[PDB]
Amino acid sequence: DMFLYNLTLQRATGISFAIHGNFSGTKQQEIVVSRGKILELLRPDPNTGKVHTLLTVEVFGVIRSLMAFRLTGGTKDYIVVGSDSGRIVILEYQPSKNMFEKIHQETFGKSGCRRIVPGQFLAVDPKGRAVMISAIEKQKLVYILNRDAAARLTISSPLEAHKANTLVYHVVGVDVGFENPMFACLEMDYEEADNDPTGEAAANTQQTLTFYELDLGLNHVVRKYSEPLEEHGNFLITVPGGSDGPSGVLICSENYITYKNFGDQPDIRCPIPRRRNDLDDPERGMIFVCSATHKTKSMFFFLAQTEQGDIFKITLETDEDMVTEIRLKYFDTVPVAAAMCVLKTGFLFVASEFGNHYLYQIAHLGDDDEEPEFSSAMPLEDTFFFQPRPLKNLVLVDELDSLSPILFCQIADLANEDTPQLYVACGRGPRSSLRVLRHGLEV
Amino acid sequence: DLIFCRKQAGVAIGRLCEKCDGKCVICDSYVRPCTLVRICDECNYGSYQGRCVICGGPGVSDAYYCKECTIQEKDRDGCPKIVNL
Amino acid sequence: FPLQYTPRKFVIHPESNNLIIIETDHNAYTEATKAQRKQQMAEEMVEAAGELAAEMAAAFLNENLPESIFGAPKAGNGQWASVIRVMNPIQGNTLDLVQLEQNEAAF
Amino acid sequence: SKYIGTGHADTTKWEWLVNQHRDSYCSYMGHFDLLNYFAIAENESKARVRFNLMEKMLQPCGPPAD
Amino acid sequence: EEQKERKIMKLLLKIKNGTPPMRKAALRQITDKAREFGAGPLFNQILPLLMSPTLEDQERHLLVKVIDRILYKLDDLVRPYVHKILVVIEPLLIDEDYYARVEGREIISNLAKAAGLATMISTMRPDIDNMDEYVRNTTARAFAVVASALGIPSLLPFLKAVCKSKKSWQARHTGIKIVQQIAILMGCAILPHLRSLVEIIEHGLVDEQQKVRTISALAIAALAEAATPYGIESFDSVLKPLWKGIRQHRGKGLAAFLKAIGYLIPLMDAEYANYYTREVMLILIREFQSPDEEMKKIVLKVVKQCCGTDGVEANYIKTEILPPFFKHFWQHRMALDRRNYRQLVDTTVELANKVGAAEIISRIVDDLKDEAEQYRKMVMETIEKIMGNLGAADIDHKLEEQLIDGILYAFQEQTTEDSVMLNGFGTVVNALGKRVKPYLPQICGTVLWRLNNKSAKVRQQAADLISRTAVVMKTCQEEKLMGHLGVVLYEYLGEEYPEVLGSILGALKAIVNVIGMHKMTPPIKDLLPRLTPILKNRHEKVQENCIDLVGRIADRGAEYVSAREWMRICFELLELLKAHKKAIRRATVNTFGYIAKAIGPHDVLATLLERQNRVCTTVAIAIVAETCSPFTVLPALMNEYRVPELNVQNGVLKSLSFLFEYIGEMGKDYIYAVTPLLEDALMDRDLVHRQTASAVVQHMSLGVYGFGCEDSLNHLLNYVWPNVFETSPHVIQAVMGALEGLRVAIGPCRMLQYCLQGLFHPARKVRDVYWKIYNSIYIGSQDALIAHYPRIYNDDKNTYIRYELDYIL
Amino acid sequence: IVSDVQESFIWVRYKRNENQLIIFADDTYPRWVTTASLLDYDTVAGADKFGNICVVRLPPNTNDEVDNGASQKAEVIMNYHVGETVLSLQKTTLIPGGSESLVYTTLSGGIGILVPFTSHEDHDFFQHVEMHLRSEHPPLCGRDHLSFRSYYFPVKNVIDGDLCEQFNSMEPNKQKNVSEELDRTPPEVSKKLEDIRTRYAFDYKDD
Ligand SMILES: CC[C@H](O)[C@@H](C)[C@H]1O[C@@H]1C[C@@](C)(O)/C=C/C=C(\C)[C@H]1OC(=O)C[C@H](O)CC[C@@](C)(O)[C@@H](OC(=O)N2CCN(C3CCCCCC3)CC2)/C=C/[C@@H]1C
Ligand SMILES: [Zn+2]
Ligand SMILES: [Zn+2]
Ligand SMILES: [Zn+2]
């Protein structure tokens, strides 16, 4: 019996999901990053930018989904977390107790990331009143977040949405105007693809942008509509609806971008532009990786990013309910991020997937440009060819360090002091580097 | 005759008549109960507001699963109400 | 200490106490294929049938974009690259550099 | 029987085989760092890896017999 | 014929009187053929059966959901019949049963989304302006139900279209009745619409009718209850016609005003609640001495909720609000009303949680000395809730003297059974503690005074009172008196009145729990034999109480009593596990553990009479086998095991089942000698051996879980496995759960490696087997199977290699 | 030591007198091996793709001089799911004048170490601390913790560290409940957990 006792010395510093909001309840704003199992809260400095870490907490599990909301009239954002086991939690912050108060749990499925068990994709309504969990199979559950007069969160029964032989690429709910709430999904059938001896249903089968409806009064989930897409789709933004801007989703996909409201809405396409003097293979397309809704009381502009480090300021144009132009305009060139957030007074938190983590202050607002704006209204059969360019808008405030992904570590002494240093070769692509690690006080 | 109902579980808590109080639900154990029991919302209505889950009497006390069915992970299935047919 | 590609493995020199870095990428171009590729594409922009009354190559051969921040010209499916380097950990500077074949990558 | 992945006395090697493929890919998507392994292994981005996996959800092992 | 469709609509009788195949399948018949059938005989046959008042709970739950399931589809054939269905469901919305009310909400909700809104409006047109209060009543609540079905802005232009029309006071009264019933039914989610609804219902506050002032401001109240608690600014125009109406009018509409104002600041800001509280307060003073019960409900609610704002100052509450309050709102005529009893109680309590303790009780100190029973019950509950919420850290000297003089003073004259003096004085002494130094022989001397006599009804309440004053008498530093009523209670062991007898015994338990076992005034060697004959009784109070007394004495003074008497305690407590009370069996198990710690495993034996149930002896073997280490009783069971004979081996297997079932984790070093014992057990002899011994495989397999033991269990597993091909369903079921335990302890890998052999064997009989085991493997923890899949190399037509498991850095 | 990609480590002895490669020991448990660093003549400290650190000892019954893959085996002494991917193991001594420590770095940028003990009394002390700390303080996201480390394999002979180091973070009434449940004062408990880090790892406190 030679038992062993685990311990740790340096926590994992890889950001995978960054949502944000007001968890202090105050005017100030904090960023829930998420590591592999180490949930962590931060705070920027509004005067010199030093991100002072405040709380870090192990969860000993698998963090698979992470969405914040706020109930009607409240001022304290919450967090929902999806688990590896078939139980969903809801958290809440405590500025004096300095911990996460649990609120409520529901039991709906088995443990372990199966197929038919939910917990994979998590849909929240933008009014906080409904929430939906959804696997990559038939089980999709919808909860209702009622608040009583006792200032707590009276959750409801689960709502069944069983449906044999479907897939799901993605689910984000729709900014509807105080109605029976609407949930979007990029389904895909395969029961066609399970009988053909020739096997042509691996072709000729495409996404439907099916919408889902809760019924508050009658306590059942019914489906709204179903319309075929054309090309296969990655992630979707909800366009801010309500009384400011129309209500839709804009489907990023293979080389195109496509608004599609339900209704009598005609659907704009606009292609993603390519760099001047490429040095690549023209076989590979270009899709997106992240999306950042900048909702202001007066207006809104997006900032999404390509594969190759290009932020796009999509300035949406529309009618009261119709849509007019999805015109495009690049913002600048930063290193690659997997999720990022925009903070008030103009902070941008570029959170890379590899290496360091960045934090940019927006120095120049608005549209003050000399390189031309693009459109969908232009006739072209030729895509838009734009210029790559140095850092012009943003400024780098501080460089938050990280070490991931550590590939090959050796512990040895290659100097003339006692302590064995830690030579780690780690990095990604041309950003990789060799790092000397020591352990003393912060010189 | 006696068979489990096996549907989705809500926020409903089961009850037990005091003659059959100490048991578990499925494996009929007695040892180390430390867990809560949820039941469905369709069989919890009307004449059934407080009722023994197993035999059908005036329920005075809750239902617990044994820790054996928790480590075994059987509770995640459908609603465990025995139904006559 | 800065590098070029994704370092797979390295070893210690025992005698002089130095480091032997080997660097390997899938989907990459090496230095020579980048160079003659850029010049050949410059020729392909002279081939566009029009006054060739002014040149883009005067500024186009000037700046190689730093691959540190300006991304990387990713291509191919069976493309490879390989770079081997010696480095001194006391100061910053490098000792020797070896570059290799296009489709032959060090392990 | 109603649970997906239940075998019985007539299920064949193609059915069992494509089942263990499909929940294999759901497990690959299910983790959080094996995707970082595949993204470091062949040089891509994580969204590209996720999309390639989701596209190879209905393709693989081709047409059935007969 | 459609009467033919009534003849096939005897399938309704097949539905209501049905098996789950008749209900599911017949449900699919009519719900798959609804629009095919039609609309007339539907209600002709559904309608009077719904009308029959002898319908039951689950029967009516059938006879609402069936209308839901066939009203999936019909959308426009109800349009002539909306009026008829509404006239039949004129009742069933305001009636007695909550179940009936919510079923009415469901059926008219589903018909409301089923039909068209304009058809609902022009169909429910002639019922706004009838004469009858009851049809405006049920009609306006029907408007609330269909409003909760189709949402708020669908109704808002019609609400504006009625609330301003000058045609009938019945009609305007009806519209505001609709708004209130919408607020009560919907409740929670009318916060963003609330400013709009205020701008509908705001101009009913300056109108000629006392009715419309009444139901209008009353509807403002029943909305702000749903708005509670924010600080919202959607109430702006509401302030002024209320503020005029207070000094303007007098009456039941002023009950409707102050009701609204109480519902209007649980949320408003500190300055607004300050200035407006000062504004209301003078007219409220003016309206204190009004007599009526409703009036005291209202202004008592008003001071409760205007006191509820944190911004209100305790200087103003204490010095300004309270002296007319305690001056005017106390009669000894306050007895019979539970509404103003409990409301006066809760109101003064919620005063005290903000204002303090010693002032509130110090204004009812001299009030204690009364000839009035329910009055003294009221102030008893008052002082007890204040001390139970705030305590005695505020309560001080020159108060406490008259306090204890008050409590013992009224305590001297007490006849009828009340709980507030016992729970009362219990919480009082919970706040007193050691602080009552110079008084205690008066307290306990008065206790003995009430204890000498009085038909046990205050010997029970006083006896309970010792049982909740014991801990102070530990912390008192006086040691003789509790010895004195100690021996007085030591006399007190003979009575045929068991409900009181449990209080004497529980007083004995709380005394013995806290009394110093060194220098016990009583001799326990004569206490315990006088304590023995109680435990052949019938009643659960004295049984549990006396068993617990045995366990506290055994828990503490174990250096005293003869093991002969302990032995008679053991055998006497053996048979008490077969009771029907979980508290009895809880006590019997724990204290049985302590007396089994007193004697132990050594003298006690196993071969106890060819006898019946013996599960109490089995659990006795389990609890002894835990409370000392089973190193004695496991080879002792081996001596009970090594006999070649029938009728015994099954019994010792069952003792193994409850045995490992009980211990689990501490029987990890005691598995080895069980293994050849489980070899002669697990070898192929008999059904009970295979079945129960397989259950022992399961329970052992769950006790060892993550605890450093596998290869033993694999050597078990190789003997477990060939037992699968057996025909009896119970024993194959125990084989199934046996393999599930071997799954969770051994792991998925070795299960699957002993599984894959004959998966594809050409024979259906062995295939049903190996597939069935494979499914039972497969449901449990499929996600662990990812690494443990055997890799199979590819054929010509398809790719079988996951290269994802084969990438190399 | 052969690092087979599906099967586990394979022990090979070479005949210097004969020029022949000999496989004599194997495993029944297929693990997706990445890396290893050895400690002695008989234990092999491996890794995995998914995150299972494993160490297998050679039994001293293994005949060194021989000629599924072998009837003889080598038994597991440890299985401990981490949850990330481990890449470079190296047994060393981090502070001067210290002890042995099997450092695991991992893929997500973290650094983990491992620990040998002193006594069964210390070990059953920490084990009872686990017994009560699990159910008497559950994890945050509701993951059944023994079923989390016991994900693929049954866990064998490891004490978790960070589960047992929440005594610096729980509520003081539960510090009373647990510290008085094991009859020990919280300065004794917290001083005992200071001693491990000041012994092996980078802790800085001066006696
Ligand atoms: C056809 C024939 C009939 O079926 C016939 C057999 C039937 O009529 C008999 C049934 C009959 C009367 O014998 C039933 C006896 C039942 C008992 C004695 C059970 O009583 C209880 O369940 C009461 C309550 O639920 C549990 C009390 C308790 C907690 O002490 C219990 O023992 C335990 O489960 N423990 C106590 C110990 N605790 C710790 C945690 C620490 C470590 C060592 C392990 C245990 C774990 C939980 C008793 C079970 C009795 C079997
Ligand atoms: Zn049910
Ligand atoms: Zn019962
Ligand atoms: Zn159970």
Numbering used by the authors:
A (entry chain A): 0 to 380, 383 to 444
B (entry chain D): 7 to 91
C (entry chain A): 779 to 829, 834 to 889
D (entry chain B): 16 to 81
E (entry chain C): 490 to 1098, 1105 to 1304
F (entry chain A): 1001 to 1067, 1083 to 1222
Show me the paper's own sentences about this structure:
SF3B1 is intimately associated with three other proteins: PHF5A, SF3B3, and SF3B5.
Here, we present the cryogenic electron microscopy (cryo-EM) structure of the SF3b subcomplex (SF3B1, SF3B3, PHF5A, and SF3B5) bound to E7107 at 3.95 Å. SF3B1 encircles PHF5A and, at the interface of the HEAT repeats 15–17, forms a deep channel from the top to the bottom face, where the BPA binds. E7107 fills this channel like a plug. Residues V1110, V1114, L1066, and V1078 from SF3B1 and residue Y36 from PHF5A make interactions with the compound. The cycloheptyl-piperazine is sandwiched between SF3B1Y1157 and PH5AR38. SF3B1R1074H and PHF5AY36C mutations confer the strongest levels of resistance (>500-fold). Both residues sit deep in the binding pocket on orthogonal sides and are situated adjacent to the diene tail of E7107.
